[PDB]
């Protein structure tokens, strides 16, 4: 659920995850889940974390997912020895680093948002915190 | 001392003839039955008229036993051959209506009421 | 009484107390809400 439509290449290096996040400030909406942690969010986790969140404000209200998967995480099969080629792709994941804003919300009461998130937070690998759009 | 296996002759009619113990009911690892202990039974021979047919599984009071029985004075009965009367599997109570040969005085009890009332001796 | 690791209140009547080192919810209202350990 939710992965790039196409890619210039199929696989990718393990990389590293140092440094503070970029899009640290809310804009698309009012309320927002800032990170505080460091880690990853497999494309499922950003999903199941969403369904918990959409099901609270119900049909009313709106939501923006600031982050997207776009990183392959390949794996070897079950009980096979090392090293006959890089393992084939399994599940996409989006790296996130501290200060990253994971979700946003609009035409909703502030107190329905602290709850709308707090449910969503329980479904996620990383630590999180509620935050506001700010006058600037 | 009756034990598993161990063919038993049957005292009552009901077409039993030859018979074989398959379990000694009572407790864990219980070994021996005699006197009038209840046990499992499985038929082997059986008469054609059949009050009960071959291959049945049942219960039975051990009655006569070759090893005999003692009692307080040190006296010792010892019948030539082992014998048991059949019992209905759920209701107990002998399914027969006659008893052949002596049974011991020890057998006496409430549930074994119907047997001692029958049979030629003791 | 349920053990559980995250105790917390249920009924408004639930109480929360710290006997020994252990934590314990206590609702005189509904008996089901007793809880140890948290």
């Amino acid at each position: 659920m939710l992965q790039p439509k196409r890619t210039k290449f199929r696989k990718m290096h393990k990389g590293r995850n140092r440094g503070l996040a970029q899009g640290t400030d809310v804009s698309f909406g009012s309320f927002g889940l800032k990170a505080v942690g460091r880690g990853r969010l497999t494309a499922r986790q950003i999903e199941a974390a969403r369904r918990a969140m959409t099901r609270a404000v119900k049909r009313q209200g709106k939501i923006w997912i600031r982050v997207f998967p776009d990183k392959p995480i390949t794996e070897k099969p079950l009980a096979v020895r090392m090293g006959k080629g890089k393992g084939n792709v399994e599940y996409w994941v989006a790296l996130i680093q501290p200060g990253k804003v994971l979700y946003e919300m609009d035409g909703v009461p502030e107190e329905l948002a602290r709850e709308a998130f707090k449910l969503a937070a329980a479904k996620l690998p990383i630590k999180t915190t509620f935050v506001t759009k700010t006058v600037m | 001392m009756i034990q598993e296996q161990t063919m038993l002759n049957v005292a009552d009619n009901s077409g039993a003839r030859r018979v074989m113990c398959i379990k000694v009911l009572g407790g864990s690892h219980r070994r021996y039955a005699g006197v009038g202990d209840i046990i499992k039974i499985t038929i082997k021979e059986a008469i054609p008229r059949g009050k009960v047919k071959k291959g049945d599984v049942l219960k039975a009071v051990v009655v006569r036993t070759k090893k005999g029985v003692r009692r307080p004075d040190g006296s010792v009965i010892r019948f030539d051959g082992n014998a048991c009367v059949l019992l209905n599997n759920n209701s107990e109570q002998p399914i027969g209506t006659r008893i052949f040969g002596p049974v011991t005085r020890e057998l006496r009890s409430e549930k074994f009421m119907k047997i001692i009332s029958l049979a030629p001796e003791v | 009484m349920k053990v559980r690791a995250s105790v917390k209140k249920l009924c408004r009547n639930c109480k929360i107390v710290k006997r020994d080192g252990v934590i314990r919810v206590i609702c005189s209202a509904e008996p089901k809400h007793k809880q140890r350990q948290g």
Binding site: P77, A79, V80 | - | -
Partner: protein
């Protein structure tokens, strides 16, 4: 409506029922539960399933019996092990289609209440 009881697609007229439709889901998902506990394990995987018309409102299944097959290979190469397990799978697909299931006195006890004494 009627609530027929299938067994590997062999509908059984003996277990037919008549119940108000809202009641059916419980009588539905329950009647299979007696069958699940008293149909002996079979050499191929089974499919008890109460259903109205062709529509199926309930299902339970008995499990396969299966030889261990792997209990022998222990060199640890996998490809050498999928070969065995592949037969275990390919052949159950055949045994499943011939199927057929004798059902003696079960169409009776408990299924006709008399699962308690004195019975």
């Amino acid at each position: 409506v009627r609530v027929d009881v299938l067994i590997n697609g062999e509908r059984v007229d003996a277990l037919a029922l008549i119940t108000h439709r809202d009641n059916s889901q419980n009588r539905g998902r329950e009647l299979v539960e007696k069958m699940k506990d008293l149909i002996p394990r079979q050499q191929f995987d089974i499919a008890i399933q109460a259903a109205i018309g062709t529509h199926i409102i309930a299902r339970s299944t008995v499990k396969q019996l299966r030889k261990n097959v792997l209990a022998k290979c222990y060199g640890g190469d996998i490809s050498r092990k999928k070969k065995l397990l592949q037969k275990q799978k390919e052949g159950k697909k055949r045994m499943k289609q011939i199927g057929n299931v004798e059902l003696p006195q079960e169409a009776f006890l408990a299924i006709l209440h008399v699962g308690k004494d004195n019975k």
